[PDB]
Assembly symmetry: D2
Homo-oligomer: 310 residues x 4
């Protein structure tokens, strides 16, 4: 199978590296306006393959995406000096206006995986331009935050991360919602399980975990300038789910008809991911606070998108 990646920057290239090291697909094609950039990353990664799995990583044009089951959209422009977020947001939106058509022209049956930030708005942008069914356009959303939430809970509770069922939903960023109320461990309520195991989650413990999840991007950016290793692996996992028609549940962003009253907005919710993209939503129980937090965040996202023209 073949996987395409448009945008060969740190996110795009890290994703290609992870796909290679984990042997997710036989062929990986990197596409970027900067031809040499893509060729360099591809060749650098190709030197790693003898030490992992036989994967053919190369740079190419949109036409080379022919037959790709999934195409990652990690395209964007470097923020020029004297430019606001809304100014930059408009530019990346323009980039997508070009990229989306090109990609589909070569591979009209691929699932589109949006990674460019802000992921939720850009997922909506890609969806409107794709003219494809809602489920065919998926954004990475809160997949990393959900996984980190489970990891921190697992450490606190002294249990395997695989046994922790917990989600981070909504808008990827400072307004994301940590769903404490309906989280579970081995099927039993989280908080209940914690206390019972002599590892009660106190308000202080919850605050510490919240900052551990919510401010990860902040800390990483402050120390290295950008984040990419985590999302590269997360994206590689979503690609794997699509290529293997896994039908697994992931907190990813997708165009949603209605969310707590808010209409036509893209945000993260637990969704079944397979060969055709997302094919079902598993809405969990929410506390009044979580539901209200999700609603308000969705409301804002709807306006942010509408204001941008989508």
């Amino acid at each position: 199978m073949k996987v395409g990646i448009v945008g060969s920057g740190m996110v795009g290239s890290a994703t290609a590296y992870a796909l290679a090291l984990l042997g997710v697909a036989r062929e990986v094609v990197l596409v970027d306006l900067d031809r040499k950039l893509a060729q360099a990353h591809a060749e650098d990664i190709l030197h790693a393959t003898p030490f992992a799995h036989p994967v053919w990583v190369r740079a190419g044009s949109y036409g080379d995406l022919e037959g790709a089951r999934a195409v990652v959209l990690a395209a964007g422009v470097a923020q020029r000096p004297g430019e606001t977020r809304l100014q930059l947001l408009d530019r990346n939106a323009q980039v997508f206006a070009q990229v989306v058509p090109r990609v589909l022209e070569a591979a009209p049956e691929a699932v589109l995986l949006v990674a460019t930030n802000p992921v939720d708005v850009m997922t909506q942008v890609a969806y409107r331009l794709s003219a494809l069914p809602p489920g065919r356009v998926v954004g990475s959303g809160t997949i990393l935050d959900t996984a980190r939430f489970r990891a921190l809970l697992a450490e606190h509770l002294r249990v395997a991360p695989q046994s922790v069922h917990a989600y981070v939903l909504g808008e990827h960023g400072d307004s994301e919602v940590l769903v404490w109320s309906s989280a579970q461990v081995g099927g039993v309520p989280l908080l209940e399980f914690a206390e019972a195991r002599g590892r009660a989650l106190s308000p202080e413990d919850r605050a510490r975990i919240d900052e551990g999840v919510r401010r990860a991007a902040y800390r990483i950016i402050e120390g290295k300038g950008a984040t990419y290793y985590g999302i590269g692996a997360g994206l590689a996992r979503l690609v794997r789910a699509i290529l293997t028609d896994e039908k697994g549940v992931y907190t990813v962003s997708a165009f949603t008809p209605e969310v707590e009253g808010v209409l036509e907005v893209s945000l993260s919710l637990p969704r079944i991911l397979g060969a055709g993209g997302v094919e079902g939503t598993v809405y969990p129980s929410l506390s009044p606070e979580e539901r209200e937090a999700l609603r308000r965040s969705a409301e804002i996202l709807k306006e942010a998108a509408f204001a941008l023209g989508f």
Copy 2:
């Protein structure tokens, strides 16, 4: 790390094969009073290692178990003509009486993983003989049944098995309890998820799934005479959980102080498994019918153990 296996029959040898092919441990030691049998299985398996992972599989004595972090007890004798179920149980209890102390002399820190049928009674037997804390003696229990239950549900629902949370508890056998009431998918009630999925579970569907889980052993034995491939892999997975101090949740058998009023009995419940054996029980919500079923099961196992002298 080293893993020991006492009893080199089809179950013990299949377990060694699975451990080798999955590369669970660097060294596997097969111990059997029938030394030629153990040597033959060990050499046969050693010939497979070049095609999988570097694992030293060898036949040895109790003394060769020194340093083992886990020792699988798949020891026992073949039923003789004219011998009843109870007489066979007594002979196997006697085998464990010789096996347990000799294993512990050589590998004092080992977790004992019991596989010999009936697994719940044999787990109680090993526990009493070991003089170790309750957590150090674990029986494979219902792990295969739980896995089959989740697989059949996943197939019916067209969802990843990893997203299905369903358990089979109690006695590994005819009285096991399929916990339908609290089964969940993606964190939501089974029946509800099935409805939203357009894959509702009819009475006929549930009956089919029940027979698929409950009668598997019967079908396999009727066709080949004995079961061993499934448990060999299940045991290998439990060994991995122990060696890696995974602290994952598995429906395995272990000595339990109290179960629905029944005192000091060994049966399967969801338990946290790590380097020291089981270290926590995650009791799921049960319907009145499932509770009575489990209580009945426990009472049966309790009387059987007591009658045997344990």
Copy 3:
């Protein structure tokens, strides 16, 4: 992809187990005149899959082999007391006369991987019956012996097996040829490397290594009654090579135009293995003694084929 296995005895079922544990193919079909036997082994193995890889192991008819890219032939008959060598050979040839055409009727594209003993004679039988090109019929041959030879040399020299280049050729059995003469380590002559590393190979060392390789089958049979774990994994590796169009070198048996003067005979030589079966021979340098042994071996194999009419 789908892999078929005709003959659901210990060799065939162990091959299915190895294929499943290693995740070589997504679908494995066991075919046997004893339907219950195949169904029982298939279900037993299916219960192991949740603990390894998603692999659909099932029992089926020859019709269920449609689209299989590789089909293992592990069918045969149990020798009858007082039956001559040639008579047993006759009976197995008659089984292949029924098996081969029925497999190819359903899977005209299948590479036939012969496992039935004597593997070299049966590979010749399958070749003649198939009417396919020479490379499409491959016997497991001496793969296990070659790997064991490399393993023993690696242990003696204290170097990784992957760095030892040594072959066992000819007839799989007591007459196989250990190619000491041109064996190499890291690209250097074996004996020279051995001395440089202060681990010289004395005539005594070589004799012990020869026995460890040549008498392995005998030892396992005397203790277990039959061998199967090793070949199961070896066959699974050959199946992987075929399915991935690996084009790797393996000492497997195939119809050869000429071997040291002997014409039209099947035996093991280093061959390139891919999706179409063997596609090239890499003939190694041989000493006068090794060549003579090989010639005599080929001569005997051709005679056995002549008696059967192949």
Copy 4:
């Protein structure tokens, strides 16, 4: 087991990413004068682990390297906009003067795996400073070049890379030597084999392959600005060899008493790598031209070491 990495730039962090994604070790510790940089890379990578293997990646001090079986030295400084070769070299030499003693103080039994360019001179520096046996200090050397040489030859011949025995020796740079004369396939002479398989290596082919191997770094640096993905995986494989006491053969750099007349110089040769570092050299046959090219390469490196004072 624990693996330390000093220097959390692109090479150091990519190595940590590869180690984590491949699940090489349970603990990976990143150390860097720029504490926030190391913490940032560690947390970014930690967000990837839930999607691969349970690996504890963290940032720490030299003290946190306690018990590390292998410590990767990817230390140095970012060449200031305007510097020169010898300058940067002397600065990195000074960094190593600070790093080496600190590392061995915390992890006295660790093997030092050098990655910093020029890898050969830096390995010599590390060796002299360590006061440890020659085998304890190993440089990644030409491992990526050797693997690429094999990959390109394998593609041209249409055979598995695993069956191609070819080396790139000497300086990991412009004077490296592609050993064509004694390269083999399946153990037989590569050149003659290619010819016999109808895939002869023409002067044009050899020139293309030489450029593909030798100029890779130039192409990558020109398009990306730096290379790191390849070496990250190569280093991860060498670390794996050390942790598992593999004793496999790799073309890595180590202090060599004498090579083609040149004395006391570090360069790449086929070496046996294990828990104690390199423990043996496997010198291959060389043509007069290759032997002279290697002599010159060694002299270039000797002169480079002299200028630095090691």
